[PDB]
Amino acid sequence: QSNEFTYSYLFRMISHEMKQKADQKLEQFDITNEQRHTLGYLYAHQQDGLTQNDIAKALQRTGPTVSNLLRNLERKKLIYRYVDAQDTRRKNIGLTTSGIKLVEAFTSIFDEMEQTLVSQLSEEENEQMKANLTKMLSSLQ
Amino acid sequence: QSNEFTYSYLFRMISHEMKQKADQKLEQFDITNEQRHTLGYLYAHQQDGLTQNDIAKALQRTGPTVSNLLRNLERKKLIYRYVDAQDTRRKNIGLTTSGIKLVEAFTSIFDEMEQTLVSQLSEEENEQMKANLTKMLSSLQ
């Protein structure tokens, strides 16, 4: 029984701890948050055969912004531009092997944290907890 | 079912919304967080007959810090020094009427938030949620 604590305190403490833990792990990679999001998007959609325009449309950013971000990632050798297998007139942007390994590394930070939490509860309890959390969030929005 | 969201996201969003809401209300009072904590302590313990020493010992702060704090609050007429009913040699620090009203006002910010959340769940669900939250928090500590 933990009835002596407010929700505000519990949610603040939990959220603080998760952020601090994730941030300390992310600080070991020389990559910005926006670059991380870019690499993740490539991980999830590069099979589509992506142009810079596709990436801008997806990340909802302007062209020059996307150009800057791709330039830095390409310099770091985390992405590459390939010739397309079905249309040799075209090039696609995709991850390099090191880009793939990098995305899997920063995703595992988040997956490991989620699994630690999930393992504290039975499957039923986890489903009830997430449903109750979204109801609560909704009552604040 | 809300199984498509991570705990990190739900806890971050809920914690953000609560902080934002509380902060917006707190911004209407010309009082610092530390002053708020001082006023609350007086609200909770002024019956003991408090000196500045007692307040420092309780707030875990040094004497000069406490002195500065009390000066600002007394200037704002939120606290007063009384002659003690049992021992006329001594004076006690306590809230004024406007101090009491101010403490009740800021507490209500937090009480209202807690009650909105509590009202989303049954009594049993609230007890289970708080217990699960502390288990989760401990798995991070």
PDB file of C-alpha atoms in Angstrom:
ATOM      1  CA  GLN A   1       0.000   0.000   0.000  1.00  0.00           C
ATOM      2  CA  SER A   2       1.350   3.351  -1.182  1.00  0.00           C
ATOM      3  CA  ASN A   3      -1.631   5.564  -0.523  1.00  0.00           C
ATOM      4  CA  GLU A   4       0.371   8.275   1.263  1.00  0.00           C
ATOM      5  CA  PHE A   5       1.894   9.545  -2.025  1.00  0.00           C
ATOM      6  CA  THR A   6       0.339  11.817  -4.622  1.00  0.00           C
ATOM      7  CA  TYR A   7       0.189  10.845  -8.314  1.00  0.00           C
ATOM      8  CA  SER A   8       2.104  14.033  -9.147  1.00  0.00           C
ATOM      9  CA  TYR A   9       5.051  12.884  -7.037  1.00  0.00           C
ATOM     10  CA  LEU A  10       5.043   9.303  -8.330  1.00  0.00           C
ATOM     11  CA  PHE A  11       4.821  10.367 -11.967  1.00  0.00           C
ATOM     12  CA  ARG A  12       7.491  13.076 -11.546  1.00  0.00           C
ATOM     13  CA  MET A  13       9.914  10.704  -9.808  1.00  0.00           C
ATOM     14  CA  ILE A  14       9.436   7.892 -12.311  1.00  0.00           C
ATOM     15  CA  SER A  15       9.690  10.241 -15.286  1.00  0.00           C
ATOM     16  CA  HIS A  16      12.810  11.878 -13.834  1.00  0.00           C
ATOM     17  CA  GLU A  17      14.542   8.553 -13.249  1.00  0.00           C
ATOM     18  CA  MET A  18      13.769   7.226 -16.734  1.00  0.00           C
ATOM     19  CA  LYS A  19      15.001  10.421 -18.413  1.00  0.00           C
ATOM     20  CA  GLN A  20      18.185  10.540 -16.410  1.00  0.00           C
ATOM     21  CA  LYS A  21      18.976   6.893 -17.170  1.00  0.00           C
ATOM     22  CA  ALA A  22      18.254   7.251 -20.884  1.00  0.00           C
ATOM     23  CA  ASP A  23      20.126  10.529 -21.186  1.00  0.00           C
ATOM     24  CA  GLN A  24      23.286   9.132 -19.599  1.00  0.00           C
ATOM     25  CA  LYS A  25      23.316   6.303 -22.116  1.00  0.00           C
ATOM     26  CA  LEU A  26      22.555   8.557 -25.094  1.00  0.00           C
ATOM     27  CA  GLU A  27      25.392  10.929 -24.127  1.00  0.00           C
ATOM     28  CA  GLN A  28      27.895   8.276 -25.234  1.00  0.00           C
ATOM     29  CA  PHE A  29      26.932   8.659 -28.908  1.00  0.00           C
ATOM     30  CA  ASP A  30      27.946  11.739 -30.901  1.00  0.00           C
ATOM     31  CA  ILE A  31      24.496  12.170 -32.392  1.00  0.00           C
ATOM     32  CA  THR A  32      21.790  14.776 -31.785  1.00  0.00           C
ATOM     33  CA  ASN A  33      18.153  13.948 -30.987  1.00  0.00           C
ATOM     34  CA  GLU A  34      17.024  15.056 -34.442  1.00  0.00           C
ATOM     35  CA  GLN A  35      19.744  12.947 -36.078  1.00  0.00           C
ATOM     36  CA  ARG A  36      18.623  10.012 -33.955  1.00  0.00           C
ATOM     37  CA  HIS A  37      15.053  10.491 -35.210  1.00  0.00           C
ATOM     38  CA  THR A  38      16.340  10.699 -38.804  1.00  0.00           C
ATOM     39  CA  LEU A  39      18.302   7.447 -38.470  1.00  0.00           C
ATOM     40  CA  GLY A  40      15.289   5.716 -36.908  1.00  0.00           C
ATOM     41  CA  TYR A  41      13.060   6.814 -39.779  1.00  0.00           C
ATOM     42  CA  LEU A  42      15.576   5.378 -42.274  1.00  0.00           C
ATOM     43  CA  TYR A  43      15.658   2.177 -40.252  1.00  0.00           C
ATOM     44  CA  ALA A  44      11.848   1.921 -40.540  1.00  0.00           C
ATOM     45  CA  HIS A  45      11.234   3.037 -44.167  1.00  0.00           C
ATOM     46  CA  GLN A  46      14.400   2.855 -46.292  1.00  0.00           C
ATOM     47  CA  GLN A  47      12.830  -0.056 -48.164  1.00  0.00           C
ATOM     48  CA  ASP A  48      10.499   2.521 -49.747  1.00  0.00           C
ATOM     49  CA  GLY A  49      13.405   4.042 -51.679  1.00  0.00           C
ATOM     50  CA  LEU A  50      13.829   7.421 -50.028  1.00  0.00           C
ATOM     51  CA  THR A  51      14.687  10.875 -51.343  1.00  0.00           C
ATOM     52  CA  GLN A  52      15.504  13.919 -49.218  1.00  0.00           C
ATOM     53  CA  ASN A  53      12.045  15.208 -50.092  1.00  0.00           C
ATOM     54  CA  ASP A  54      10.457  12.034 -48.721  1.00  0.00           C
ATOM     55  CA  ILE A  55      12.406  12.458 -45.463  1.00  0.00           C
ATOM     56  CA  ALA A  56      11.448  16.114 -45.119  1.00  0.00           C
ATOM     57  CA  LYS A  57       7.788  15.287 -45.734  1.00  0.00           C
ATOM     58  CA  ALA A  58       7.993  12.549 -43.099  1.00  0.00           C
ATOM     59  CA  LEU A  59       9.902  14.466 -40.394  1.00  0.00           C
ATOM     60  CA  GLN A  60       7.845  17.583 -41.145  1.00  0.00           C
ATOM     61  CA  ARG A  61      10.955  19.753 -41.600  1.00  0.00           C
ATOM     62  CA  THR A  62      12.120  22.067 -44.411  1.00  0.00           C
ATOM     63  CA  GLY A  63      14.513  21.109 -47.218  1.00  0.00           C
ATOM     64  CA  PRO A  64      17.637  22.987 -46.047  1.00  0.00           C
ATOM     65  CA  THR A  65      17.227  21.521 -42.562  1.00  0.00           C
ATOM     66  CA  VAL A  66      17.091  17.999 -43.959  1.00  0.00           C
ATOM     67  CA  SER A  67      20.072  18.707 -46.207  1.00  0.00           C
ATOM     68  CA  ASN A  68      22.142  19.800 -43.214  1.00  0.00           C
ATOM     69  CA  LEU A  69      21.202  16.738 -41.188  1.00  0.00           C
ATOM     70  CA  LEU A  70      21.958  14.292 -44.021  1.00  0.00           C
ATOM     71  CA  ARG A  71      25.279  15.965 -44.744  1.00  0.00           C
ATOM     72  CA  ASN A  72      26.399  15.467 -41.154  1.00  0.00           C
ATOM     73  CA  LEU A  73      25.250  11.847 -41.027  1.00  0.00           C
ATOM     74  CA  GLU A  74      26.883  11.083 -44.363  1.00  0.00           C
ATOM     75  CA  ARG A  75      30.113  12.663 -43.133  1.00  0.00           C
ATOM     76  CA  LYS A  76      29.884  10.379 -40.102  1.00  0.00           C
ATOM     77  CA  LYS A  77      29.409   7.498 -42.555  1.00  0.00           C
ATOM     78  CA  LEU A  78      26.120   6.425 -40.969  1.00  0.00           C
ATOM     79  CA  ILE A  79      24.102   6.843 -44.162  1.00  0.00           C
ATOM     80  CA  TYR A  80      24.798   6.393 -47.869  1.00  0.00           C
ATOM     81  CA  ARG A  81      23.173   7.050 -51.202  1.00  0.00           C
ATOM     82  CA  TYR A  82      22.602   3.887 -53.218  1.00  0.00           C
ATOM     83  CA  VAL A  83      21.721   3.333 -56.874  1.00  0.00           C
ATOM     84  CA  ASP A  84      18.162   1.937 -57.056  1.00  0.00           C
ATOM     85  CA  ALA A  85      17.835  -1.719 -58.051  1.00  0.00           C
ATOM     86  CA  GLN A  86      14.780  -1.204 -60.257  1.00  0.00           C
ATOM     87  CA  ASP A  87      15.598   2.181 -61.703  1.00  0.00           C
ATOM     88  CA  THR A  88      19.322   2.868 -62.328  1.00  0.00           C
ATOM     89  CA  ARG A  89      18.470   6.490 -63.041  1.00  0.00           C
ATOM     90  CA  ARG A  90      17.767   6.993 -59.345  1.00  0.00           C
ATOM     91  CA  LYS A  91      19.486   6.987 -55.964  1.00  0.00           C
ATOM     92  CA  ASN A  92      18.059   6.118 -52.571  1.00  0.00           C
ATOM     93  CA  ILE A  93      19.152   7.147 -49.090  1.00  0.00           C
ATOM     94  CA  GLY A  94      19.738   4.311 -46.622  1.00  0.00           C
ATOM     95  CA  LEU A  95      21.646   3.282 -43.529  1.00  0.00           C
ATOM     96  CA  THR A  96      25.137   1.919 -43.675  1.00  0.00           C
ATOM     97  CA  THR A  97      26.019  -1.110 -41.586  1.00  0.00           C
ATOM     98  CA  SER A  98      27.298   1.217 -38.862  1.00  0.00           C
ATOM     99  CA  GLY A  99      24.068   3.216 -39.114  1.00  0.00           C
ATOM    100  CA  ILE A 100      22.052   0.038 -38.589  1.00  0.00           C
ATOM    101  CA  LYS A 101      24.135  -0.952 -35.568  1.00  0.00           C
ATOM    102  CA  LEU A 102      23.778   2.574 -34.160  1.00  0.00           C
ATOM    103  CA  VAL A 103      19.969   2.584 -34.479  1.00  0.00           C
ATOM    104  CA  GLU A 104      19.721  -0.826 -32.849  1.00  0.00           C
ATOM    105  CA  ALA A 105      21.913   0.460 -29.992  1.00  0.00           C
ATOM    106  CA  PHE A 106      19.817   3.544 -29.193  1.00  0.00           C
ATOM    107  CA  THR A 107      16.544   1.644 -29.605  1.00  0.00           C
ATOM    108  CA  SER A 108      17.754  -0.977 -27.118  1.00  0.00           C
ATOM    109  CA  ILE A 109      18.141   1.772 -24.483  1.00  0.00           C
ATOM    110  CA  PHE A 110      14.411   2.366 -24.696  1.00  0.00           C
ATOM    111  CA  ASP A 111      13.472  -1.272 -25.093  1.00  0.00           C
ATOM    112  CA  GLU A 112      15.493  -2.341 -22.060  1.00  0.00           C
ATOM    113  CA  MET A 113      13.882   0.352 -19.909  1.00  0.00           C
ATOM    114  CA  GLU A 114      10.381  -0.621 -21.024  1.00  0.00           C
ATOM    115  CA  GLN A 115      11.067  -4.309 -20.360  1.00  0.00           C
ATOM    116  CA  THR A 116      12.349  -3.663 -16.839  1.00  0.00           C
ATOM    117  CA  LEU A 117       9.061  -1.952 -16.032  1.00  0.00           C
ATOM    118  CA  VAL A 118       6.890  -4.495 -17.817  1.00  0.00           C
ATOM    119  CA  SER A 119       8.532  -7.330 -15.882  1.00  0.00           C
ATOM    120  CA  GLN A 120       7.316  -5.846 -12.555  1.00  0.00           C
ATOM    121  CA  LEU A 121       3.711  -6.639 -13.443  1.00  0.00           C
ATOM    122  CA  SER A 122       1.705  -9.578 -14.776  1.00  0.00           C
ATOM    123  CA  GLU A 123       0.428  -9.260 -18.346  1.00  0.00           C
ATOM    124  CA  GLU A 124      -3.051  -8.338 -17.089  1.00  0.00           C
ATOM    125  CA  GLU A 125      -1.676  -5.743 -14.701  1.00  0.00           C
ATOM    126  CA  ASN A 126       0.374  -4.160 -17.499  1.00  0.00           C
ATOM    127  CA  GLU A 127      -2.693  -3.829 -19.736  1.00  0.00           C
ATOM    128  CA  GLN A 128      -4.779  -2.326 -16.923  1.00  0.00           C
ATOM    129  CA  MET A 129      -1.928   0.029 -15.969  1.00  0.00           C
ATOM    130  CA  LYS A 130      -1.479   1.357 -19.495  1.00  0.00           C
ATOM    131  CA  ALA A 131      -5.223   1.819 -19.975  1.00  0.00           C
ATOM    132  CA  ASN A 132      -5.516   3.634 -16.676  1.00  0.00           C
ATOM    133  CA  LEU A 133      -2.544   5.834 -17.566  1.00  0.00           C
ATOM    134  CA  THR A 134      -4.112   6.934 -20.847  1.00  0.00           C
ATOM    135  CA  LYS A 135      -7.416   7.664 -19.124  1.00  0.00           C
ATOM    136  CA  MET A 136      -5.555   9.783 -16.585  1.00  0.00           C
ATOM    137  CA  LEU A 137      -3.572  11.573 -19.281  1.00  0.00           C
ATOM    138  CA  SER A 138      -6.836  12.217 -21.103  1.00  0.00           C
ATOM    139  CA  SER A 139      -8.337  13.828 -17.983  1.00  0.00           C
ATOM    140  CA  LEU A 140      -5.486  16.361 -18.052  1.00  0.00           C
ATOM    141  CA  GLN A 141      -5.893  17.104 -21.766  1.00  0.00           C
TER     142      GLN A 141
ATOM    143  CA  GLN B   1      -6.234  -1.158 -24.750  1.00  0.00           C
ATOM    144  CA  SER B   2      -3.266   1.225 -24.789  1.00  0.00           C
ATOM    145  CA  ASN B   3      -0.567  -1.359 -25.354  1.00  0.00           C
ATOM    146  CA  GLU B   4       1.047   0.523 -28.247  1.00  0.00           C
ATOM    147  CA  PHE B   5       2.612   3.139 -25.925  1.00  0.00           C
ATOM    148  CA  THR B   6       5.729   2.840 -23.814  1.00  0.00           C
ATOM    149  CA  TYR B   7       5.723   3.622 -20.072  1.00  0.00           C
ATOM    150  CA  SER B   8       8.412   6.250 -20.677  1.00  0.00           C
ATOM    151  CA  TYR B   9       6.082   8.188 -22.987  1.00  0.00           C
ATOM    152  CA  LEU B  10       3.003   7.903 -20.734  1.00  0.00           C
ATOM    153  CA  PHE B  11       4.886   8.927 -17.592  1.00  0.00           C
ATOM    154  CA  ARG B  12       6.679  11.797 -19.378  1.00  0.00           C
ATOM    155  CA  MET B  13       3.435  13.161 -20.832  1.00  0.00           C
ATOM    156  CA  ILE B  14       1.456  12.912 -17.593  1.00  0.00           C
ATOM    157  CA  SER B  15       4.274  14.441 -15.586  1.00  0.00           C
ATOM    158  CA  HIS B  16       4.679  17.270 -18.126  1.00  0.00           C
ATOM    159  CA  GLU B  17       0.984  18.134 -18.102  1.00  0.00           C
ATOM    160  CA  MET B  18       0.760  18.149 -14.297  1.00  0.00           C
ATOM    161  CA  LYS B  19       3.831  20.359 -13.956  1.00  0.00           C
ATOM    162  CA  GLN B  20       2.650  22.750 -16.629  1.00  0.00           C
ATOM    163  CA  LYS B  21      -0.790  23.084 -15.023  1.00  0.00           C
ATOM    164  CA  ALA B  22       0.571  23.515 -11.494  1.00  0.00           C
ATOM    165  CA  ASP B  23       3.213  25.983 -12.613  1.00  0.00           C
ATOM    166  CA  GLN B  24       0.701  28.200 -14.398  1.00  0.00           C
ATOM    167  CA  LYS B  25      -1.324  28.507 -11.213  1.00  0.00           C
ATOM    168  CA  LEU B  26       1.692  29.020  -8.948  1.00  0.00           C
ATOM    169  CA  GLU B  27       2.879  31.868 -11.207  1.00  0.00           C
ATOM    170  CA  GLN B  28       0.027  34.039  -9.951  1.00  0.00           C
ATOM    171  CA  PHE B  29       1.545  34.315  -6.454  1.00  0.00           C
ATOM    172  CA  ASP B  30       4.603  36.467  -5.741  1.00  0.00           C
ATOM    173  CA  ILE B  31       6.238  33.693  -3.750  1.00  0.00           C
ATOM    174  CA  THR B  32       9.239  31.433  -4.319  1.00  0.00           C
ATOM    175  CA  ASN B  33       9.139  27.638  -4.026  1.00  0.00           C
ATOM    176  CA  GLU B  34      11.296  27.844  -0.898  1.00  0.00           C
ATOM    177  CA  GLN B  35       8.979  30.450   0.635  1.00  0.00           C
ATOM    178  CA  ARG B  36       6.036  28.212  -0.226  1.00  0.00           C
ATOM    179  CA  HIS B  37       7.719  25.307   1.587  1.00  0.00           C
ATOM    180  CA  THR B  38       8.388  27.595   4.569  1.00  0.00           C
ATOM    181  CA  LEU B  39       4.749  28.732   4.777  1.00  0.00           C
ATOM    182  CA  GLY B  40       3.521  25.138   4.555  1.00  0.00           C
ATOM    183  CA  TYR B  41       5.790  24.053   7.384  1.00  0.00           C
ATOM    184  CA  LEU B  42       4.395  26.870   9.543  1.00  0.00           C
ATOM    185  CA  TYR B  43       0.899  25.778   8.563  1.00  0.00           C
ATOM    186  CA  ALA B  44       1.747  22.245   9.742  1.00  0.00           C
ATOM    187  CA  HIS B  45       3.747  22.936  12.929  1.00  0.00           C
ATOM    188  CA  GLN B  46       3.270  26.491  14.239  1.00  0.00           C
ATOM    189  CA  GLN B  47       1.416  24.915  17.173  1.00  0.00           C
ATOM    190  CA  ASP B  48       4.786  23.777  18.543  1.00  0.00           C
ATOM    191  CA  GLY B  49       5.924  27.352  19.191  1.00  0.00           C
ATOM    192  CA  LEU B  50       8.631  27.845  16.592  1.00  0.00           C
ATOM    193  CA  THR B  51      11.888  29.781  16.609  1.00  0.00           C
ATOM    194  CA  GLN B  52      14.063  30.428  13.562  1.00  0.00           C
ATOM    195  CA  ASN B  53      16.291  27.622  14.860  1.00  0.00           C
ATOM    196  CA  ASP B  54      13.382  25.189  14.713  1.00  0.00           C
ATOM    197  CA  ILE B  55      12.593  26.201  11.130  1.00  0.00           C
ATOM    198  CA  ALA B  56      16.197  25.866   9.970  1.00  0.00           C
ATOM    199  CA  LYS B  57      16.515  22.477  11.650  1.00  0.00           C
ATOM    200  CA  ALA B  58      13.329  21.312   9.915  1.00  0.00           C
ATOM    201  CA  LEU B  59      13.962  22.769   6.436  1.00  0.00           C
ATOM    202  CA  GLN B  60      17.593  21.571   6.535  1.00  0.00           C
ATOM    203  CA  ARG B  61      18.927  25.079   5.777  1.00  0.00           C
ATOM    204  CA  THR B  62      21.437  27.392   7.478  1.00  0.00           C
ATOM    205  CA  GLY B  63      20.540  30.245   9.822  1.00  0.00           C
ATOM    206  CA  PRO B  64      21.273  33.162   7.476  1.00  0.00           C
ATOM    207  CA  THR B  65      19.201  31.527   4.741  1.00  0.00           C
ATOM    208  CA  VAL B  66      16.238  31.131   7.075  1.00  0.00           C
ATOM    209  CA  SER B  67      16.664  34.722   8.266  1.00  0.00           C
ATOM    210  CA  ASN B  68      16.485  36.034   4.700  1.00  0.00           C
ATOM    211  CA  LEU B  69      13.385  33.920   4.013  1.00  0.00           C
ATOM    212  CA  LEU B  70      11.533  35.043   7.121  1.00  0.00           C
ATOM    213  CA  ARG B  71      12.393  38.691   6.479  1.00  0.00           C
ATOM    214  CA  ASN B  72      10.847  38.588   3.006  1.00  0.00           C
ATOM    215  CA  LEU B  73       7.713  36.816   4.257  1.00  0.00           C
ATOM    216  CA  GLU B  74       7.256  39.158   7.201  1.00  0.00           C
ATOM    217  CA  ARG B  75       7.667  42.152   4.902  1.00  0.00           C
ATOM    218  CA  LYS B  76       4.829  40.701   2.809  1.00  0.00           C
ATOM    219  CA  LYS B  77       2.795  40.374   6.018  1.00  0.00           C
ATOM    220  CA  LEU B  78       2.345  36.607   5.581  1.00  0.00           C
ATOM    221  CA  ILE B  79       3.969  35.689   8.894  1.00  0.00           C
ATOM    222  CA  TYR B  80       4.188  37.365  12.303  1.00  0.00           C
ATOM    223  CA  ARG B  81       5.997  36.953  15.589  1.00  0.00           C
ATOM    224  CA  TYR B  82       3.670  36.400  18.531  1.00  0.00           C
ATOM    225  CA  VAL B  83       4.210  36.514  22.292  1.00  0.00           C
ATOM    226  CA  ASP B  84       3.857  32.968  23.651  1.00  0.00           C
ATOM    227  CA  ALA B  85       0.760  32.276  25.759  1.00  0.00           C
ATOM    228  CA  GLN B  86       2.556  30.016  28.228  1.00  0.00           C
ATOM    229  CA  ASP B  87       5.795  31.958  28.508  1.00  0.00           C
ATOM    230  CA  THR B  88       5.662  35.767  28.022  1.00  0.00           C
ATOM    231  CA  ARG B  89       9.433  35.868  27.812  1.00  0.00           C
ATOM    232  CA  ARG B  90       9.262  34.221  24.401  1.00  0.00           C
ATOM    233  CA  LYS B  91       8.033  34.837  20.873  1.00  0.00           C
ATOM    234  CA  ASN B  92       6.805  32.372  18.286  1.00  0.00           C
ATOM    235  CA  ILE B  93       6.701  32.564  14.499  1.00  0.00           C
ATOM    236  CA  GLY B  94       3.314  31.884  12.920  1.00  0.00           C
ATOM    237  CA  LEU B  95       1.130  32.570   9.931  1.00  0.00           C
ATOM    238  CA  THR B  96      -1.049  35.601   9.673  1.00  0.00           C
ATOM    239  CA  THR B  97      -4.568  35.275   8.343  1.00  0.00           C
ATOM    240  CA  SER B  98      -3.332  36.111   4.844  1.00  0.00           C
ATOM    241  CA  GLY B  99      -0.565  33.536   5.300  1.00  0.00           C
ATOM    242  CA  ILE B 100      -3.131  30.865   6.163  1.00  0.00           C
ATOM    243  CA  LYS B 101      -5.267  31.801   3.154  1.00  0.00           C
ATOM    244  CA  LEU B 102      -2.179  31.708   0.925  1.00  0.00           C
ATOM    245  CA  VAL B 103      -1.170  28.232   2.127  1.00  0.00           C
ATOM    246  CA  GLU B 104      -4.715  26.928   1.638  1.00  0.00           C
ATOM    247  CA  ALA B 105      -4.746  28.395  -1.868  1.00  0.00           C
ATOM    248  CA  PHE B 106      -1.535  26.789  -3.043  1.00  0.00           C
ATOM    249  CA  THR B 107      -2.279  23.441  -1.391  1.00  0.00           C
ATOM    250  CA  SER B 108      -5.617  23.348  -3.214  1.00  0.00           C
ATOM    251  CA  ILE B 109      -3.729  23.460  -6.542  1.00  0.00           C
ATOM    252  CA  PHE B 110      -2.191  20.124  -5.673  1.00  0.00           C
ATOM    253  CA  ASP B 111      -5.260  18.682  -4.004  1.00  0.00           C
ATOM    254  CA  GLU B 112      -7.448  19.504  -7.005  1.00  0.00           C
ATOM    255  CA  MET B 113      -4.978  17.842  -9.390  1.00  0.00           C
ATOM    256  CA  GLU B 114      -4.775  14.708  -7.254  1.00  0.00           C
ATOM    257  CA  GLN B 115      -8.557  14.489  -6.954  1.00  0.00           C
ATOM    258  CA  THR B 116      -9.108  14.776 -10.717  1.00  0.00           C
ATOM    259  CA  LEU B 117      -6.835  11.787 -11.198  1.00  0.00           C
ATOM    260  CA  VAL B 118      -8.257   9.762  -8.317  1.00  0.00           C
ATOM    261  CA  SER B 119     -11.773  10.256  -9.720  1.00  0.00           C
ATOM    262  CA  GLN B 120     -10.818   8.415 -12.945  1.00  0.00           C
ATOM    263  CA  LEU B 121     -10.468   5.138 -11.055  1.00  0.00           C
ATOM    264  CA  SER B 122     -12.357   3.069  -8.486  1.00  0.00           C
ATOM    265  CA  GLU B 123     -10.948   2.939  -4.959  1.00  0.00           C
ATOM    266  CA  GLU B 124      -9.472  -0.502  -5.633  1.00  0.00           C
ATOM    267  CA  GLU B 125      -7.931   0.626  -8.910  1.00  0.00           C
ATOM    268  CA  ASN B 126      -6.338   3.647  -7.218  1.00  0.00           C
ATOM    269  CA  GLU B 127      -4.734   1.482  -4.531  1.00  0.00           C
ATOM    270  CA  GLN B 128      -3.440  -0.986  -7.116  1.00  0.00           C
ATOM    271  CA  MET B 129      -2.122   1.809  -9.348  1.00  0.00           C
ATOM    272  CA  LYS B 130      -0.206   3.495  -6.547  1.00  0.00           C
ATOM    273  CA  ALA B 131       1.294   0.210  -5.383  1.00  0.00           C
ATOM    274  CA  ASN B 132       2.357  -0.699  -8.910  1.00  0.00           C
ATOM    275  CA  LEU B 133       3.849   2.762  -9.403  1.00  0.00           C
ATOM    276  CA  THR B 134       6.031   2.476  -6.309  1.00  0.00           C
ATOM    277  CA  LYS B 135       7.170  -0.994  -7.373  1.00  0.00           C
ATOM    278  CA  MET B 136       8.088   0.421 -10.780  1.00  0.00           C
ATOM    279  CA  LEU B 137       9.879   3.398  -9.236  1.00  0.00           C
ATOM    280  CA  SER B 138      11.894   1.077  -7.006  1.00  0.00           C
ATOM    281  CA  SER B 139      12.957  -1.027 -10.017  1.00  0.00           C
ATOM    282  CA  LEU B 140      14.560   2.186 -11.283  1.00  0.00           C
ATOM    283  CA  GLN B 141      16.178   2.988  -7.932  1.00  0.00           C
TER     284      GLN B 141
END
